Design a binder for this molecule. Structure first.
Ligand SMILES: *[C@@H]1O[C@H](CO)[C@@H](O[C@@H]2O[C@H](CO)[C@@H](O)[C@H](O)[C@H]2NC(C)=O)[C@H](O[C@@H]2O[C@@H](C)[C@@H](O)[C@@H](O)[C@@H]2O)[C@H]1NC(C)=O
Ligand SMILES: *[C@@H]1O[C@H](CO)[C@@H](O[C@@H]2O[C@H](CO)[C@@H](O)[C@H](O)[C@H]2NC(C)=O)[C@H](O[C@@H]2O[C@@H](C)[C@@H](O)[C@@H](O)[C@@H]2O)[C@H]1NC(C)=O
Ligand SMILES: *[C@@H]1O[C@H](CO)[C@@H](O)[C@H](O[C@@H]2O[C@@H](C)[C@@H](O)[C@@H](O)[C@@H]2O)[C@H]1NC(C)=O
Ligand SMILES: *[C@@H]1O[C@H](CO)[C@@H](O)[C@H](O[C@@H]2O[C@@H](C)[C@@H](O)[C@@H](O)[C@@H]2O)[C@H]1NC(C)=O
Ligand SMILES: OC[C@H]1O[C@H](OC[C@H]2O[C@@H](O)[C@H](O)[C@@H](O)[C@@H]2O)[C@H](O)[C@@H](O)[C@H]1O
Ligand SMILES: OC[C@H]1O[C@H](OC[C@H]2O[C@@H](O)[C@H](O)[C@@H](O)[C@@H]2O)[C@H](O)[C@@H](O)[C@H]1O
Ligand SMILES: [Ca+2]
Ligand SMILES: [Ca+2]
Ligand SMILES: [Mn+2]
Ligand SMILES: [Mn+2]
Lengths: 237, 237
């Protein structure tokens, strides 16, 4: 029961996507998760983008869980080096029809006053009390406190290619981050049992957030643009 | 406990390498695993390169197994498209002081008359009776019949960047293959328990092989050059 799709660019007001909060599609077709005005990224911003149709990751009847592969390119430009950019972006899987969560270090996927389960791969740029040095790739399950973490050096404003893959048979979720201009490769993997954390049908998308006002630092910001995206899932049941 | 090494290029008569059979270091500093004469790759060739000192992947005392990361660049040039190039190169871990094994589809690591255990990541270019379509990346444990396999399109004579990583905690062995000139990314991962297949101390290196004479095809050949190599392992024990 293979479901797939592929965006090589985002057309003005896509009918296939659900934009939430600050998330919007620029004129030259890039998906801007967080707010940016007159070419400058703003603080206190939060946006999500979900694929309109829900996907089935597992079937209670057969018991089978799906295997999927997703690839996307993103770009994070950090105009203000000091004191520290924030907060990063995540690719995530959550239950259908959920609301944007807390911003800042929560990327907009975690909501303390009404937590919903989720699996996410984060590209963290700000170091919270629970974070290892940044920037880092992290694998998150129901929490923003990563199970596994790996550090990476960002290519400011450059392009990044990400490949996230999940094998239902081995339950291995491996992610690859490549910065073509620098020729650097970062890899990370962990075991995650989707069947054990998520409902049969879920939503897949991105979420990002800039510096929280409580930090009292307007320079705590950056862009979180998604250039293209393809997803593919195969449920044998 | 940490051991590591890096090779930005290879020197003629490198003291920390162990060249075996056809393996030799070219003047312009590349490591040629298989024979190549007058700029042309020969058939019936087999060569290996091992890191001189042995590495400890696990400690029987504490029971701890090591985590390691290795990165290398290689290049495979296929001068003769038809009838078929052969056979490929592999990165491998084996017991200390082993002799080159059978050539051809065995890459020089498997010896039917005296099989020794080994873990290897293969870059297979010839399709044997036990192979899926080629070329393909495969994860091998004690056998040349891969546990997991993924197909990839080679960049003839181009450069390839490989990243192999192993987490002792999850027992996940993930490999990434990137062809910078084409911008393609191939990923594969599987669970391997080193402690269960290998001795406490091992040797790490490369091995490659060109077409076997029994195939009666001199065009069954290609180059197997390693351009650079870095290795790092950690044993909390
Ligand atoms: C917020 O980012 C601004 C641009 O990155 C910083 O301003 C720049 O600061 C440089 C030295 O830090 C200075 O040479 C530049 O001329 C100046 N450029 C701009 C766009 O004003 C700013 O730095 C601090 O605050 C500003 C207002 C100045 O007073 C600087 O001297 C300060 O270092 C950054 N502010 C923060 C939150 O640190
Ligand atoms: C082994 O590789 C050789 C070099 O690529 C092949 O020769 C080339 O074959 C082409 C077609 O296969 C032909 O257009 C080229 O002119 C030729 N190049 C030269 C001068 O060597 C060789 O091909 C065999 O020999 C040629 C003359 C034809 O009879 C082909 O049909 C033959 O396959 C390759 N031999 C094998 C075993 O495939
Ligand atoms: C962060 O964004 C929210 C939503 O756009 C704004 O309401 C915040 O503005 C501040 O709070 C509101 C209620 C209002 O009092 C306004 O004047 C405040 O500036 C904004 N936070 C900040 C501090 O910019
Ligand atoms: C393949 O290479 C090995 C070692 O490099 C040779 O020993 C093989 O055999 C030798 O060459 C053949 C032609 C024959 O003369 C034999 O007596 C030699 O031992 C070689 N095989 C081939 C076909 O080249
Ligand atoms: O300013 C950006 C930052 O603000 C929030 O947290 C501020 C943070 O400041 C640090 O210096 C302190 O150590 C820490 O305790 C405070 O929480 C926000 O949580 C963070 O994600 C980011 O927006
Ligand atoms: O030609 C190079 C090739 O030689 C051996 O395999 C030959 C192969 O020929 C096929 O036609 C048959 O179907 C198969 O049974 C034979 O094995 C060698 O084993 C292989 O790795 C490669 O070098
Ligand atoms: Ca953070
Ligand atoms: Ca083969
Ligand atoms: Mn984090
Ligand atoms: Mn194979």
């Amino acid at each position: 029961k293979t479901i797939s799709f592929n965006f090589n660019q985002f057309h003005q007001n896509e009918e296939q996507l659900k934009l939430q909060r600050d998330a919007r599609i620029s004129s030259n077709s890039v998906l801007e998760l967080t707010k940016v005005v007159n070419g400058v990224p703003t603080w206190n911003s939060t946006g999500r983008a979900l694929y309109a149709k829900p996907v089935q990751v597992w079937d209670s009847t057969t018991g089978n869980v799906a295997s999927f592969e997703t690839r996307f390119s993103f770009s994070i430009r950090q105009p203000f080096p000091r004191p520290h950019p924030a907060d990063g972006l995540v690719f995530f899987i959550a239950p259908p029809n959920t609301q944007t969560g807390e911003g800042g270090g929560y990327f907009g996927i975690y909501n303390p006053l009404s937590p919903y389960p989720f699996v996410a791969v984060e590209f963290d740029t700000f170091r919270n009390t629970w974070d290892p040095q940044i920037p880092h790739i992290g694998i998150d399950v129901n929490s923003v406190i990563s199970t596994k973490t790996v550090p990476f050096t960002l290519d400011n404003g450059g392009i990044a290619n990400v490949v996230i893959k999940y094998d239902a048979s081995t339950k291995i979720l491996h992610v690859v981050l490549v910065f073509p201009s620098l020729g650097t490769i970062y890899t990370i993997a962990d075991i995650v049992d989707l069947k054990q954390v998520l409902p049969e049908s879920v939503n897949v998308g991105f979420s990002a957030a800039t510096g929280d006002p409580s930090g009292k630092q307007r320079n705590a910001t950056e862009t979180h643009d998604i250039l293209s995206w393809s997803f593919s899932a195969s449920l044998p049941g």
